[PDB]
Design an enzyme around this catalytic site. Structure first.
Site, mmCIF file in Angstrom:
data_model
loop_
_atom_site.group_PDB
_atom_site.id
_atom_site.type_symbol
_atom_site.label_atom_id
_atom_site.label_comp_id
_atom_site.label_asym_id
_atom_site.label_seq_id
_atom_site.Cartn_x
_atom_site.Cartn_y
_atom_site.Cartn_z
ATOM 1 N N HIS A 40 -10.611 -0.512 0.646
ATOM 2 C CA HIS A 40 -9.762 -1.044 1.726
ATOM 3 C C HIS A 40 -10.502 -1.107 3.087
ATOM 4 O O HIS A 40 -10.020 -1.753 4.037
ATOM 5 C CB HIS A 40 -8.386 -0.354 1.787
ATOM 6 C CG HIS A 40 -8.359 0.898 2.597
ATOM 7 N ND1 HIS A 40 -8.374 2.152 2.019
ATOM 8 C CD2 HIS A 40 -8.283 1.093 3.936
ATOM 9 C CE1 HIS A 40 -8.299 3.069 2.972
ATOM 10 N NE2 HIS A 40 -8.259 2.453 4.141
ATOM 11 N N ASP A 84 -9.486 2.566 -5.118
ATOM 12 C CA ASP A 84 -9.925 2.349 -3.723
ATOM 13 C C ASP A 84 -11.316 2.956 -3.502
ATOM 14 O O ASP A 84 -11.492 4.070 -2.959
ATOM 15 C CB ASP A 84 -8.860 2.931 -2.783
ATOM 16 C CG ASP A 84 -9.065 2.505 -1.333
ATOM 17 O OD1 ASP A 84 -9.856 1.572 -1.085
ATOM 18 O OD2 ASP A 84 -8.421 3.109 -0.452
ATOM 19 N N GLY A 175 -8.793 5.689 10.413
ATOM 20 C CA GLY A 175 -10.124 5.803 10.945
ATOM 21 C C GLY A 175 -10.940 6.833 10.176
ATOM 22 O O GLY A 175 -12.144 6.845 10.283
ATOM 23 N N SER A 177 -10.584 6.843 6.919
ATOM 24 C CA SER A 177 -10.656 6.157 5.624
ATOM 25 C C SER A 177 -12.085 5.919 5.191
ATOM 26 O O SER A 177 -12.938 5.600 6.007
ATOM 27 C CB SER A 177 -9.990 4.794 5.722
ATOM 28 O OG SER A 177 -8.612 4.975 5.781
ATOM 29 N N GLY A 178 -12.330 6.050 3.894
ATOM 30 C CA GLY A 178 -13.679 5.824 3.368
ATOM 31 C C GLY A 178 -14.549 7.096 3.364
ATOM 32 O O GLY A 178 -15.530 7.142 2.645
#
Ligand SMILES: [Ca+2]
Length: 223
Positions: A40, A84, A175, A177-178
């Site tokens: 995402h 994801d 923020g 995320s990942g």
């Protein structure tokens, strides 16, 4: 990260910032030429920034390297966030030492109750907005699958786990995320989603990396 602590410069040496003119997502360095992040987080025109603490100041340990290729998981579903996960290949190999280092892939899945380190430059408030310039850290346990499914009925797949605190107050956020969830020195999770941040009975949901090791290894070996 809500309710966390300041990590300290280069204490999380595998943490990367993904930059497209500004920080937008975190990621993890898994070898000198590959980064793993959340699907995402996908964008074209990614620069990977390694060795960062303050993302607004050049402090001397940074390596800025453009992405040559991004590969979103073949079964990523953007509506459910199932699968994801994405890999990013760097145009050149990073230079590795104590302050920039890769994190190991797991050989087995981690159990409920394992304590993990989650890190990133995301929002630090559960209501309102305040983005830090320096990297924030949070220690959090993996929750049982039963807890996780009860918090999010009909939404948790086998490719997801919950980590955090059912009482609220401490969580990852927009923020982050990942970015990495590391447990016992292995990458077990990727910051994926949640309902708001740090809300009661709404823990963070993370991509379950141990389910993807063969895909990651095969992909790396051929690209
Ligand atoms: Ca910096």
């Amino acid at each position: 990260i809500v309710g966390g602590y300041t990590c300290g410069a280069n204490t999380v040496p595998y943490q990367v910032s993904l930059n497209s003119g500004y920080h937008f997502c975190g990621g993890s360095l898994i070898n000198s030429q590959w980064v793993v992040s959340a699907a995402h987080c996908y964008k074209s025109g990614i620069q990977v920034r390694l060795g960062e603490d303050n993302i607004n100041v050049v402090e001397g340990n940074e390596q800025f390297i453009s992405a040559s290729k991004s590969i979103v998981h073949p079964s990523y579903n953007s509506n459910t966030l199932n699968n994801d996960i994405m890999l990013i290949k760097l145009k050149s190999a990073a230079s590795l030492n104590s302050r920039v280092a890769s994190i190991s892939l797991p050989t087995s899945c981690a159990s409920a109750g394992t304590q993990c380190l989650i890190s990133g430059w995301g929002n630090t408030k559960s209501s309102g907005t305040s983005y830090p310039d320096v990297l924030k850290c949070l220690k959090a346990p993996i929750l049982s699958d039963s807890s996780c499914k009860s918090a999010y009925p009909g939404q948790i797949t086998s490719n997801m786990f919950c980590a955090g605190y059912l009482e609220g107050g401490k969580d990852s956020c927009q923020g982050d995320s990942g970015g990495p969830v590391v447990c016992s020195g292995k990458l077990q999770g990727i910051v994926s989603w949640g309902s708001g941040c740090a809300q009661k009975n709404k823990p963070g949901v993370y991509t379950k990396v141990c389910n993807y090791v063969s895909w990651i290894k095969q992909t790396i070996a051929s690209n």
